Write a protein that binds this ligand. Structure first.
Ligand code: NAG
Lengths: 50, 49, 50
């Protein structure tokens, strides 16, 4: 959980669901919340922010 | 379904009353106060919704 | 002489409330289960704040 992940696991991807309290999983970062579009800009090759 | 309940046990080891915390705001208030009798006024509740 | 002097005194402060379950275990079911083992501690702070 530092960089973009290059070697990974054999799990199937799923379509995005917007505006609903769902359990997400982004590169092994599990959680629970609602998903909204963003206007924030990131540094290159940076995955997530806190 | 996985839900939140609250149960009351009497003086003989049996279940006599129960409430579901996700049905009504009144039931959510009962689950937050953790009692079946509540008094007059305004209270703040948890998220069992 | 007639002199008018002023005296400032506080009366009240802000009223605040804290949701214990969402401060400690934010949207986590497992942490909620582990929090019920600590019985009747979150209900003791709401009484004081009220
Ligand atoms: C239940 O407990 C009470 C009080 O201990 C007792 O009087 C009664 O005989 C018990 N049994 C029933 C069936 O109520």
């Amino acid at each position: 959980l530092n960089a973009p992940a290059t070697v990974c696991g054999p799990k199937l991807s799923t379509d995005l669901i917007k505006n609903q309290c769902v359990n997400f999983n982004f590169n092994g970062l599990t959680g629970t919340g609602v998903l909204t579009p963003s206007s924030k800009r990131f540094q290159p090759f940076q995955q997530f922010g806190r | 379904k996985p839900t939140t309940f609250m149960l009351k046990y009497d003086e003989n080891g049996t279940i006599t009353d129960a409430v579901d915390c996700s049905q009504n705001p009144l039931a959510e208030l009962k689950c937050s106060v953790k009692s079946f009798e509540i008094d007059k006024g305004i209270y703040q509740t948890s998220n069992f919704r | 002489s007639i002199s008018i002097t002023t005296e400032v005194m506080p009366v009240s402060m802000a009223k605040t409330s804290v949701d214990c379950n969402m401060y400690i275990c934010g949207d986590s079911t497992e942490c909620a289960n582990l929090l019920l083992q600590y019985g009747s501690f979150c209900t003791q702070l709401n009484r004081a704040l009220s």
